[PDB]
C-alpha cells in the first residue's frame, strides 16, 4: 500500500498477500456481520482504488450484494460527475483534471494517474471518496442481510436480561436510523420491553438512569 518512506516521500507498494488472505477468509467465514465494517477500514488504509477493486473481487459467492454495491458505486459516480463542473482544456504539467466517474471507480484510470492524484497539491482523496462509497454500500448490504428488525425483539419470561440487552444492542448497531432516533429508542424501548420485575425496578429508578445502574438494580 501507499506508505510514507522513513524521512522520505510517500511511495506506492504492492498489497501484502496475507492481508488479502485474511480479508477473504473473514469475509467467507462471517455472513457480513456488522463487525466486519470497521475491519475493512483496518485493512485498506491509504490504498489506491485499483487495490480496492482487487480486494473486492476476491470474494467467493454472495454475488447479489456485490452487484448491488457495484450499482450503487456507479450511481454515486454519476452523481459526483453531475454535481462537479467538468473542467475542459489543457492539463497542467505534474497535475491532472478532476477524475471522472470511471476514474474514481478505478476501472479506467491507470496507476500513474492515481499516484499523480495522490501526490497532487491540493490533495485529491479520490480513494477516500471511493472508500466512503464502499462503506455506504456495505451498510446497505448489512441492512439487506439483517434477519429481523429491532422493534419486534422480545425478552423471555425467565431469560437472564444480560443476553437480552446484548442482542438488543447488537441489533441496534445494525440500524440505519438517525442518531437522535437511536438515542430515543435506546432510552425507551429496552426499559419498556423488559420483564415485569426488572421493569418495575427501572421505573422506580426513574428516567436518566445509566445502563450500569439499570443492570445492577436488576441483578439476581
Amino acid at each position: 500500500p501507499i506508505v510514507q518512506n522513513l524521512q522520505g516521500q510517500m511511495v506506492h507498494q504492492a498489497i501484502s498477500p496475507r492481508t488479502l488472505n485474511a480479508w477473504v477468509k473473514v469475509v467467507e467465514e462471517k455472513a457480513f456481520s456488522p463487525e466486519v465494517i470497521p475491519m475493512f477500514s483496518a485493512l485498506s488504509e491509504g490504498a489506491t482504488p485499483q487495490d480496492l477493486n482487487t480486494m473486492l473481487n476476491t470474494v467467493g459467492g454472495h454475488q447479489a450484494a456485490m452487484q448491488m454495491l457495484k450499482e450503487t458505486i456507479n450511481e454515486e459516480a454519476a452523481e459526483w460527475d453531475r454535481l462537479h463542473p467538468v473542467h475542459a482544456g489543457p492539463i497542467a504539467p505534474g497535475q491532472m483534471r478532476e477524475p471522472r466517474g470511471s476514474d474514481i471507480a478505478g476501472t479506467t484510470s491507470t496507476l500513474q494517474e492515481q499516484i499523480g492524484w495522490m501526490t497532487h497539491n491540493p490533495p485529491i482523496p479520490v480513494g477516500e471518496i471511493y472508500k466512503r462509497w464502499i462503506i455506504l454500500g456495505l451498510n446497505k448490504i448489512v441492512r439487506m442481510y439483517s434477519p429481523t428488525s429491532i422493534l419486534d425483539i422480545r425478552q423471555g419470561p425467565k431469560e437472564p436480561f444480560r443476553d437480552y440487552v446484548d442482542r438488543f444492542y447488537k441489533t441496534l448497531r445494525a440500524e440505519q436510523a438517525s442518531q437522535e432516533v437511536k438515542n430515543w429508542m435506546t432510552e425507551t424501548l429496552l426499559v419498556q420491553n423488559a420483564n415485569p420485575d426488572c421493569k418495575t425496578i427501572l421505573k422506580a429508578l426513574g428516567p436518566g438512569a445509566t445502563l450500569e445502574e439499570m443492570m445492577t438494580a436488576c441483578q439476581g
Binding site: 434477519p147 425483539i153 422480545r154 423471555g156 425467565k158 431469560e159 437480552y164
Partner: protein, 245 residues
C-alpha cells in the same frame, strides 16, 4: 439399602429424580423414596413412528423429536430457523436410530429442499398432519425439569442436554416402571429377534392346508385351531373342516 440412604440423598440433591427411580435403582422402600422427594425444596405403533416438532423457549427455537412407541426424546436448539438445520437434525437422528415414518406439520422448514432431499435419501415415509397428548405432556415435563436444572446451568444447550439425559434415563415410565431408553431397547430387540425367527422357519416349514377353497399355507396349528394365510388374508378356523397335507 445398606447405607444407600446417603447415596440416594446425595444423588437426589443433583438429579431430583422421582421416588420410584430411587426405589428401583438403589433398592429402597417406596416410603423413604417419597420422603426424600418431599424433603427436596425443588420437588413437590411401529418403532419407526417418530414425531418432530418446533417449540419456543426464551426467544429460542428448539426442534424436538420423540419416539411415539417408546417415549424416547431428543431435542436441539436451532440457532436460526432454517430448513438446513432441520435436515441436519433429521439425518443425525436417522444415523443414530432407524426411522421409517415422520409425523410433522406443513411448515415451510418441514418442507425444505434439504429436508426433502435427506428424507428421500434415507427412504423415510413422510406424513404431514397428525397421540399428541403424550407429546404435550413430555414437552411440559421437559420444560419443568429445565426450570429445575436452570439454576445450575450456564447456557441453554447444556441445560437442554441435561434435561434430556435426566428424562431418558433417570425417569421411570409407565408399564413396568421402565425408562424411555429401556423401553426402546426392549422393543427394538424384540422386533429384531421376532423377525429373525420368522425368517428362519420360512425355508424349512412349508405345509398346504385345505379348508371348506384354495391351497392355503399353514401358519399355526394348535389348541384346536388352525390359523392360515391365503391371498394375503389371514383366516382362523376350527380344527374341524381343515385338512393338513
Amino acid at each position: 439399602f445398606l447405607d444407600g440412604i446417603d447415596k440416594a440423598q446425595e444423588e437426589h440433591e443433583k438429579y431430583h429424580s422421582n421416588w420410584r427411580a430411587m426405589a428401583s435403582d438403589f433398592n429402597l422402600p417406596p416410603v423413604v423414596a417419597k420422603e426424600i422427594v418431599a424433603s427436596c425444596d425443588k420437588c413437590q405403533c411401529s418403532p419407526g413412528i417418530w414425531q418432530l416438532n418446533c417449540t419456543h423457549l426464551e426467544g429460542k427455537v428448539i426442534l424436538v423429536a420423540v419416539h411415539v412407541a417408546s417415549g424416547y426424546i431428543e431435542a436441539e436448539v436451532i440457532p436460526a430457523e432454517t430448513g438446513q438445520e432441520t435436515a441436519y437434525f433429521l439425518l443425525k437422528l436417522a444415523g443414530r436410530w432407524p426411522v421409517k415414518t415422520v409425523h410433522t406439520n406443513n411448515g415451510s422448514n418441514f418442507t425444505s429442499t434439504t429436508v426433502k432431499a435427506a428424507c428421500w435419501w434415507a427412504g423415510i415415509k413422510q406424513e404431514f398432519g397428525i397421540s399428541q397428548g403424550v407429546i404435550e405432556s413430555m414437552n411440559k415435563e421437559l420444560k419443568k425439569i429445565i426450570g429445575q436444572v436452570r439454576d445450575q446451568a450456564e447456557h441453554l444447550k447444556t441445560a437442554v442436554q441435561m434435561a434430556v439425559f435426566i428424562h431418558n434415563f433417570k425417569r421411570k415410565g409407565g408399564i413396568g416402571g421402565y425408562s424411555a431408553g429401556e423401553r426402546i431397547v426392549d422393543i427394538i430387540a424384540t422386533d429384531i429377534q421376532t423377525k429373525e425367527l420368522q425368517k428362519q422357519i420360512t425355508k424349512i416349514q412349508n405345509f398346504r392346508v385345505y379348508y371348506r377353497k384354495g391351497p392355503a399355507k399353514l401358519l399355526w396349528k394348535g389348541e384346536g385351531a388352525v390359523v392360515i394365510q391365503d391371498n394375503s388374508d389371514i383366516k382362523v378356523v376350527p380344527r374341524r373342516k381343515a385338512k393338513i397335507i
